Structure 1
Amino acid sequence: QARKLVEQLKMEANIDRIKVSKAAADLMAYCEAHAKEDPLLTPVPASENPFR
């Protein structure tokens, strides 16, 4: 059963990686770009709010 595990680990080894700075920058840019249209983040107006 060790052959399957080592083959899977070898398959996982050969994948491209991007620096954590780039990934964090992308996440921050997305959170900034979509921040405006978030009902939870910005309290929605009572008229616009469906539940209440």
Structure 2
Amino acid sequence: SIAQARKLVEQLKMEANIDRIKVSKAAADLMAYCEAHAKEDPLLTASENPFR
């Protein structure tokens, strides 16, 4: 399967060339999102329960 190897070789180069950022920024964004949308989670935090 020389061809199978060729297909594998091309994909890695495409995977290799991409733009990436530091994990600190992503962690900060996730924490900010969780903090901002933490006031609208009925499971996490009693106006009505439809099941009541």
Per the shorter chain, which TM-score range?
A: 0.7 to 0.9
Count of aligned pairs = 49
Give every structure 1 segment of 4 or more consecutive aligned residues whose post-TM-superposition deviation is greater than 3 Å.
Answer: none
Q: TM-score normalized by structure 1? A: 0.84
Larger of the two Rg values belongs to structure: 2
Q: TM-score normalized by structure 2? A: 0.84
Superposition RMSD in Å: 1.1
Q: CA deviation at 1:6?
A: 1.1
- CA distance 1:21–1:37, shift in 2 (3 Å): same
Deviations 1:7-36 (A, max 9, x none): 111101111001000000000000000000
Unaligned stretches of 5+ residues in structure 1:
none
